[PDB]
Structure 1
Amino acid sequence: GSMTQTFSSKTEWRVRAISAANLHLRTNHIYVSSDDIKETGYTYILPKNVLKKFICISDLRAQIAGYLYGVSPPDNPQVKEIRCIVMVPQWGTHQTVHLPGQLPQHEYLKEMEPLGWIHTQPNESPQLSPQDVTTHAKIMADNPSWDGEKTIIITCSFTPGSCTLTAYKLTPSGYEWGRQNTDKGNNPKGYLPSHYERVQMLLSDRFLGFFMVPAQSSWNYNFMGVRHDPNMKYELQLANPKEFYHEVHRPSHFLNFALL
């Protein structure tokens, strides 16, 4: 014999939405890991305002990514000031992000140079992901405007009560390994720490960046993943992005509640 009890659902995205509402406290505690023995290549200056907005629109489990666009201070070709973050239609897991194949295209970015991408990560990591090496290399192979000596990966790792940023570039050998890689697991054959190196990065308050977002939709498709396609096309607009759990990212929750 036995007794009798009934199941009341406990959906995970609600705990995540509550948690994401508190992301703003991390923006007052952002750290840049400076442990590179010597800088390799350039110095990247990320404006604080877009970094903090990028933190506030993210999720603690599902990675988001944004493309980096910038220029060099007039007399200093070895500094790259990050001037814009582009959010494109995307979805993610805790280990990787899925972006479309098409890179941002817009008149406002035409006098800027692509500097790579930024993405969030649940946990700090001594090494750059092989997912990230593969993503950067496959982008480089599809798009020759991405020079390996100039484009970077900024990871924003969620460390307790805070955020730690670290910025990497690919190496020739890293590019060549990542473009041919098809094992998407945590330990693909061939992966080496000689595939990437750490570039210097600074957080600045003296200038402001801006955002570009899609024109006909938003950027978050983690609740609509079906509608997301690697071959999908999109235009952009000068505007600031909506937070991860904003209503227009999860319309099915609102319509299916009103059902019953």
Structure 2
Amino acid sequence: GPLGSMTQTFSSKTEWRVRAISAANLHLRTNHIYVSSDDIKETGYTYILPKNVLKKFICISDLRAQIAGYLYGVSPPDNPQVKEIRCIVMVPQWGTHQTVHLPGQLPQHEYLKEMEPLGWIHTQPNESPQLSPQDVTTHAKIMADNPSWDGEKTIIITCSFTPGSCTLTAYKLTPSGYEWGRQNTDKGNNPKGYLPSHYERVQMLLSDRFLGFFMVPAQSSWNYNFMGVRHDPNMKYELQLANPKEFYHEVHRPSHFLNFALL
């Protein structure tokens, strides 16, 4: 019985600080990246992700809120069954632990006109035996709105935060996966109709032989996880040839700095 005896006051806490301290350590995982490429599939299309941009993509991310980048590349001159990822494009986005929210508009820039869209990559808190139904729906709706995304050619790379490390897996949709995903409204973890035959794993190799590069928005940054209302599926954006800033960088959370000035 407190009665009048015991009274304690609430000192606030905040989750983004713990996550920010955590995100400062993401560079440790970049020395320990594993590709879960021991799969039944043989040949098919083979995707080559350069290590430099993958490491950068890991360092700018968050351990809770997924982030995503668009993949662009080409085939080596005389080997068309191999796709080399040459560029990752960060666009205005905001995520949760289960999904990311990207604009309807796809990257547009003359510097990518000689390249080929190869799909997307995104972080994920935990490894999973199967491809998420959120991912199937996302990829299928992007395919339905953008005919340049070939079902036989665009992939979903998941970068999962295993303890001390990052584990990569690459998937593609099947025609059944496409058709189911483009008509799915259930955001839940088990929407009706979702099947494992909706995707298949594709071959994926990390390489040090060549370097990728990044493109980022021209008039903002990519992270909107602190400016959710400023984000809109119909937002338009331009791009520039530059490297992206980490998740908890100051330009991504201006209200923190402007509101601490109010005591």
TM-score range, shorter chain: over 0.9
- Contact 1:39/1:198 (CA < 8 Å) preserved in 2? no
1:18-58: CA deviation from partner (whole Å, max 9, x where unpaired):
00000000000000002211236300000000000000000
1:81 to 76, 84, 97: 84
Is 1:130 the counterpart of 2:133? The answer is yes
Report the alpha carbon displacement of residue 137 of structure 1 after superposing the two structures with TM.
Answer: 0.1
- Contact 1:40/1:198 (CA < 8 Å) preserved in 2? no
Aligned counterparts of 2:5 and 2:227: Cα–Cα separation in 1: 42
- Contact 1:41/1:149 (CA < 8 Å) preserved in 2? no
Aligned counterparts of 1:165 and 1:252: Cα–Cα separation in 2: 34
Aligned to 1:20: 23
How many matched pairs? 260
Report the alpha carbon displacement of residue 8 of structure 1 after superposing the two structures with TM.
Answer: 0.4
Structure 2: any 5+ residue segments left out of the alignment? none
Aligned counterparts of 1:221 and 1:27: Cα–Cα separation in 2: 24
Report the alpha carbon displacement of residue 2 of structure 1 after superposing the two structures with TM.
Answer: 4.6
- Contact 1:41/1:150 (CA < 8 Å) preserved in 2? no
- Equivalent residues in 2 for 1:58-207 (5 A)? 58-207=61-210
Aligned counterparts of 1:112 and 1:136: Cα–Cα separation in 2: 19
Aligned-residue CA RMSD (Å):
0.7
Aligned counterparts of 1:21 and 1:215: Cα–Cα separation in 2: 25
Aligned counterparts of 2:216 and 2:229: Cα–Cα separation in 1: 20
Moved over 3 A (4+): none
The TM-score normalised by the length of structure 1 is 0.99
- Contact 1:158/1:164 (CA < 8 Å) preserved in 2? yes
Report the alpha carbon displacement of residue 187 of structure 1 after superposing the two structures with TM.
Answer: 0.5
- Contact 1:90/1:98 (CA < 8 Å) preserved in 2? yes
Structure 1: any 5+ residue segments left out of the alignment? none
1:217-250: CA deviation from partner (whole Å, max 9, x where unpaired):
0000000011000000000000000000000000
- Contact 1:130/1:187 (CA < 8 Å) preserved in 2? yes
SS in 2 for 1:84: strand
Aligned counterparts of 1:75 and 1:8: Cα–Cα separation in 2: 64
Aligned counterparts of 2:43 and 2:178: Cα–Cα separation in 1: 16
The TM-score normalised by the length of structure 2 is 0.98
Aligned counterparts of 1:197 and 1:37: Cα–Cα separation in 2: 10
Aligned counterparts of 2:29 and 2:36: Cα–Cα separation in 1: 16
1:56-89: CA deviation from partner (whole Å, max 9, x where unpaired):
0000000000000000000100000000000000
